[PDB]
Symmetry: D4
Subunit: 150 residues, 8 copies
């Protein structure tokens, strides 16, 4: 990658539907060269895909949680427990962390009941779990994980 | 929205580049109807945009953090402190939460030094901050915020 | 329910002994209609009953506690442990909660000794309990659970 | 009070609408004597009133919280802060407690938004508040504060 | 007991060697009556004994600790664990408490090594112990447990 | 001090009323020598006094507490705050400690109300106090501070 | 640096007094080349100096502590507070850290009194300090900071 | 040891390469006497060795951690767990401590990955470990364990 690739990525992280002509006009480079650079970024794994940003509210995902998990330590518990947490419907983020907790889990549900049934009731039966503490999100001030270049 | 819209969104959340012909063939509906439904979803704000999923590793974003923030309480501190945290370069997520902490901040940096300079040194001067506790992410087990329909 | 039902309930939550004539005069509706609406609210389960508010002090219930419970996680522990806590004499409230604790228990006793014997000594033998932390209530500033309409 | 008064109260705490004839038949005492004893209990302040038990669900009170409050210490802060917390719409219980927190607050709201606006946004501006930690109630296992005699 | 007994006890809690003549002169009562009252207080168990207050420093007891204990819950653990803690040489106080810990232990030793050997190494092997947290006393501001009447 | 002094002190810490003849017979030394050694121990400050051990229960001291105090740091706060805590009626022990808290306070009261009025209400107004956490003693397993020689 | 430099450093980190002839014989290289490489490592700042490892016990440094510090946040508090902590006699390590605390301080003293006077009493007056928690080291299992190559 | 030995040690703790002539000139004593005193200090174990102070940065040791360990209590766990922690490559300090944790571990690694593999993955399999909390060092303000005489 170089300076040009970064300028292209800075645009694509926000609008993957911007036309080649418009991008070429903005960054000032041939459209053929632009297409070549983009294909190379995809081929090299820099661009792993293109997603539609869907408004969680439209799907009534109003029960947003950030759960901290304390594990029962054992050989390779981070991979085993991490994978069990990752396969729970509604869970989009699972992080192995340093601190008083071992994992931070990000999840979304429509209601308190769905959250209890799909998440809480599943987690309580996982053997590698010592206990968890769920922080309910009252307000999402910002959630733009797509922005990697500021 | 209806059952058809959900099937369309379930595909677009993963691959926004899938052709209309391929989607129409998969969900079994006219291409003209598909384009109409998609445009309506965009118009109604269900689909807020399309982003390229960039591999954070390609940008050397190896210093991943989840910071818990305790605020100095005051009238409307959640909005004021939330906005100050949201404008820090590298911060992609800011959540107002219930629990022993008031905000959870998600951020990415290339190094320990960049993290100290861009994030730590900025946060320590914000008047609404009482203190913070940063959990370093050793391993990202899963991070697919784009998936809203499981 | 409608606006009228709410006005009736707002009165009944405070004084269930208020005469039909007095209520009818206050909210301005026929006594026959009032009786009909009240019976329907009872039939529909909105009004589950009528209780006498007894002064806990008259019964010497001076040892008031709010106990936080950490559970030993397992399949359906919330229902099993919750029910074991609920059947302890003196316990009037049991809540399954989110946070560093799993249950919050509200109880009343006449003395420290009765509290130890009836509550502490029973809880310590429950297998689903990891540990508990009891907060002694020094002063009840307010306790009006009967008020559901402010 | 005596043994008879306790038997009367044990019934009234559950059903304040039970007829005098039925109560007299159950506890085995003259109806005239029963009415006299009941009036004396009311006069002496043992029975402070009669309330209708309304199903919180019927009022859509699905956002149930138990908030722990850490105060900024000062002369008589327990009374001053306690009273400010007690006047917040939706708050039915305020307890001055011993432990790592100073007050425990019980409240009910219909939604996350109402909770933020009516409770969170009011509490954050109270000068006597250092900070709070809210535990969201996922499931009410038991809530029968009316039972004072087990 | 009466007002006179309290005046006698208020003196004896400080100086058990004060002569009968001096006490009688101070509180203004016959020496014979004084001796009678004192003997009755001893007989009734109010006065359980007389001890010499020895300066801990003279015995080089410079390692003063207050240890909080978290227990592994079980039937009657408070009595069983309490008694095991009470028999450890150097331990003078063992309290079963409410809060995040279950016991508070007061102990004195001459050195860090003696403390580790006599206390730490014994406690770590007790099955009813989950863990402990020891607070080292840097300075004793006050320690007059003999004063029961202020 | 020597081996003989220790044997004398080991007896006096339990029974300061034991006669000279009985002590002399037990430890096997002349009564004149015993009296001389005892007087020297008093003169040298080893024996600071003699107290009557009064049963706290006889004085209805049923509200026993161990309060942890977090201070507002400042020059010499340990001495200033320590002395303010030490002069509160009912407080018999004040310890400056290492750990998450700065002082541990031992106190006794007859009731919850007396504890609130004499202790809680006084402590909340002390400027050097950040906050406190009170652990209520449910049961005193052991409290023999008089034993310095095991 | 290369493989040879690492082998030289692996020896020097343990014994800086080992003769050139002995080192040359061990790693198998000319003494002249060895001296050249060592001088270059010193010149390049890899080897910052040579110290005598003194047994702390010989200096009666028996009061070993690890203190966690919570700071009062402000612009550049990490540098300002860090430097104030670093200049305290007895303090050999000061670390700015991530977590519930902001600094970890390593210090050694001969006694409890010296620790209180030189460290505690100085730290309590530093304006940037909110509070501290000192962990007393009962036993040093290992302390070989000189080993950088395992 | 005496005053002269201390002056010699105060120099050697900083520069073990200072010539005998220079030291003798500085402290004002015969070179023969200086050599004798130094040899005696080594023989008596006061000076345990001489090490080269290597700049950790030169070895790319940028992942610096201070890990707190909670143990599963058992007979002699402090020695057994302490020794298991001490043998982990990268760990230079292991301290058995008083407080909410039982051990404090100091370690250095080149990267997050090396830290996870060499330290985290080894510690999670140790049976005596209940859990750990790692504090990442953002900045080393001071690290001069060689200074024992201030
Ligand atoms: N510049 C454009 O947009 C198209 C022509 C350009 N020369 C190319 O190579 O694509
Ligand atoms: N998994 C481990 O080995 C330790 C993880 C723990 N969260 C820590 O920070 O140390
Ligand atoms: N089905 C297709 O893909 C194209 C023709 C279809 N009838 C339409 O309306 O678009
Ligand atoms: N902002 C507030 O009013 C309180 C927020 C706090 N985190 C809580 O859970 O109560
Ligand atoms: N209004 C009253 O109180 C009684 C008469 C009224 N018309 C009724 O239907 O009950
Ligand atoms: N029961 C569970 O699955 C978790 C409950 C826990 N109190 C939490 O907040 O996460
Ligand atoms: N017992 C009753 O119910 C009514 C008659 C009874 N003798 C009385 O005094 O009321
Ligand atoms: N208000 C006070 O004085 C102290 C209250 C505090 N919650 C405690 O338990 O000590
Ligand atoms: N008062 C005294 O001290 C001695 C005489 C007194 N009348 C008595 O009965 O003991
Ligand atoms: N022993 C028990 O049952 C509970 C004791 C615990 N310390 C508490 O405060 O609840
Ligand atoms: N031994 C006694 O009790 C009294 C006589 C003894 N010879 C003395 O000197 O006191
Ligand atoms: N007073 C101080 O300087 C610090 C006291 C604090 N309790 C500690 O352990 O560090
Ligand atoms: N090898 C030695 O120890 C000395 C001779 C060697 N040729 C040198 O250059 O130093
Ligand atoms: N200094 C800061 O900005 C925050 C430091 C704090 N210890 C943390 O981990 O977040
Ligand atoms: N003083 C020196 O440096 C050398 C001579 C001195 N008289 C000695 O004994 O070593
Ligand atoms: N090992 C033990 O016995 C107790 C150690 C614990 N860290 C404490 O401070 O008490
Ligand atoms: Mg995206
Ligand atoms: Mg009611
Ligand atoms: Mg005494
Ligand atoms: Mg060294």
């Amino acid at each position: 990658m170089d300076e040009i690739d970064l300028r292209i990525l800075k645009i694509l992280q926000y609008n993957a539907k911007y036309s080649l002509d418009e991008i070429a006009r903005e960054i000032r480079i041939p459209k053929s060269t632009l297409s070549y650079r983009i294909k190379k970024l995809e081929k090299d794994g820099v661009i792993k895909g293109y997603y539609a940003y869907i408004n969680p509210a439209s799907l009534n995902l109003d029960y947003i949680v950030i759960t901290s998990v304390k594990a029962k330590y054992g050989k390779n518990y981070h991979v085993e427990l991490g994978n069990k947490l990752a396969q729970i419907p509604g869970v989009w983020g699972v992080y192995f962390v340093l601190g008083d907790n071992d994992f931070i889990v990000m999840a979304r549900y429509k209601t308190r009941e769905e959250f209890m049934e799909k998440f809480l009731e599943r987690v309580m039966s996982i053997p590698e779990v010592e206990r968890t503490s769920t922080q309910v999100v009252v307000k999402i001030i910002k959630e733009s994980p797509n922005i990697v270049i500021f």
